[PDB]
Amino acid sequence: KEFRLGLITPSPHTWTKAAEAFGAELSEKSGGAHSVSVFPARQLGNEAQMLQQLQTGALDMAFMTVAEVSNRVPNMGAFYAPYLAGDINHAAAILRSDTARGMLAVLPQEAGVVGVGFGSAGMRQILSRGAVNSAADLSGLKLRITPFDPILDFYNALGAAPTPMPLPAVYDALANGQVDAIDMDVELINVLKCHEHADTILISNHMMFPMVGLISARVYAGMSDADKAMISELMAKHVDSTLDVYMVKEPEWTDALTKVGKTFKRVDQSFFGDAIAQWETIWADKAPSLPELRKTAADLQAENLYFQ
Ligand SMILES: O=C(O)c1cccc(O)c1
């Protein structure tokens, strides 16, 4: 079978490379019986559209933001608790935990997809066209976000003016003043060159940004038993590989952003004042897995079970 695999990420992005690597290995491991055609850069639609077509089976596979999935399955919102992870290495350990993996079990019924495992992109950061010396400076700023509720809620609690916008429009929106600031990770700040019209780069690491490898449940049900196992295991391997890329490259891409002639500062949880508390109140009755995920995160840190 010729499977199609969609992503919203541009071609240089880690996810896109991982999807191509997965496709190559599936072709080889299947002895040519199967192939994967990868469609990056939103070629097949936006992420919401792609999830709709995974649900029907019109689209076979995706490497998808857990952000979009959370629009369908609000418990996925638990991963976005601010400062749940202290850094990318902590985040990877959380996403590999039994607690996280258990949350995948609901996807076939609730979203019509099989989630094989979690990967990630980098941590979230903030880039602004003006000076930012405290959280008050974010008040009223038109601030680009990924279109999902956890991040909307964080910025609403801070009093910014969050504005959902897909990746391709962001550089132009900054250049032309349609937004004053953006929420984005260091990989894409580098790749999309969004620092060019920014004043200040804030390395806040305020939220993680998981990825999930998805197979349409309708398509999965049509696979042989051997292929269900082989394809899901192979996809899980490639999705998991992204965690190791970010564990290595996050600080490298971050250091690159000290070389673009802008004001560069690192901030921690205290910078955000009461927004973190407000976020917890909003999400307490929306994401029941949150207390267990917090316990898992805390135990991983206490037992030093990742590189730190
Ligand atoms: O900021 C985003 O919307 C985004 C979406 C996908 C991957 C990624 O690194 C970032």
- Cα(9) to ligand 1 centroid in Å equals 7
Find how far residue 201's CA is from the centre of its chain.
Answer: 20
Q: Which two tokens stand for residue 302?
A: 């206490």
Q: Which amino acid is at 115?
A: G
Q: Which amino acid is at 261?
A: G
Note the residue count of the chain.
308
Q: Which two tokens stand for residue 8?
A: 């919203």
* CB-based pocket (< 6 A), ligand 1: 8-9, 65, 121, 146, 167, 184-185, 187-188
d(CA 57, CA 249): 35
d(CA 167, CA 194): 11
CB 194 within 8 A of CB 188: yes
Q: How far, CA to CA in Å, does 127 sit from each of 179, 181, 190, 249?
A: 11, 5, 12, 19
Q: Which two tokens stand for residue 6?
A: 């969609």
Residues 6+ apart with CB under 8 A from 302: none
d(CA 278, CA 284): 10
CB 143 within 8 A of CB 180: yes
Residues 6+ apart with CB under 8 A from 285: none
CA dihedral 170, 171, 177, 178 (to 10 degrees): -20
> Whose CA is closest to 22, among 211, 224, 189?
211
Find how far residue 181's CA is from the centre of its chain.
Answer: 19
d(CA 228, CA 232): 6
39 DSSP β-pair partners = 6
CA dihedral 76, 82, 83, 87 (to 10 degrees): 60
Atom of ligand 1 nearest to the CA of 8: 6
Q: How far, CA to CA in Å, does 120 sit from each of 129, 180, 209, 259?
A: 27, 27, 6, 25
CB 186 within 8 A of CB 253: yes
This structure's resolution (Å) is 1.4
Find how far residue 11's CA is from the centre of its chain.
Answer: 16
User: Which residue has the CA at smallest separation from atom 1 of ligand 1?
Assistant: 184
Question: Residues 144, 293, 120, CA angle at the centre, nearest 5°?
Answer: 45
> Whose CA is closest to 4, among 14, 13, 26, 12?
26
Q: How was this structure determined?
A: X-ray
Find how far residue 71's CA is from the centre of its chain.
Answer: 13
Is 101 one of the annotated binding-site residues?
no
Q: Which amino acid is at 201?
A: I
CB 100 within 8 A of CB 77: no
Find how far residue 225's CA is from the centre of its chain.
Answer: 30
What does the H/E/C string look like for the chain?
A: CEEEEECCCCCCCHHHHHHHHHHHHHHHHCCCCCEEEEECCCCCCCHHHHHHHHHHCCCCEEEEEHHHHHHHCHHHHHHHCCCCCCCHHHHHHHHCCHHHHHHHHHHHHHHCEEEEEEEECCCCEEEECCCCCCHHHHCCCEEEECCCHHHHHHHHHHCCEEEECCHHHHHHHHHCCCCCEEEECHHHHHHCCHHHHCCEEEECCCCCCEEEEEEEHHHHHCCCHHHHHHHHHHHHHHHHHHHHHHHHHHHHHHHHCCCCCCEEEECCHHHHCCHHHHHHHHHCCCCCCHHHHHHHHHHHHHCCCCCC
d(CA 84, CA 225): 37
Find how far residue 54's CA is from the centre of its chain.
Answer: 18
Is 182 one of the annotated binding-site residues?
no
Residue 30: exposed, middle, or buried by beta-carbon count in 10 A (0-12, 13-18, 19+)? middle
d(CA 253, CA 209): 16
Write down all domains in the chain, each with its CATH number in brackets.
1-308 (3.40.190.170)
User: Which residue has the CA at smallest separation from atom 8 of ligand 1?
Assistant: 121
- Please, what is the end-to-end C-alpha distance for the chain in angstroms? 43
Q: How far, CA to CA in Å, does 245 sit from each of 41, 149, 227, 282, 304?
A: 20, 27, 27, 33, 20
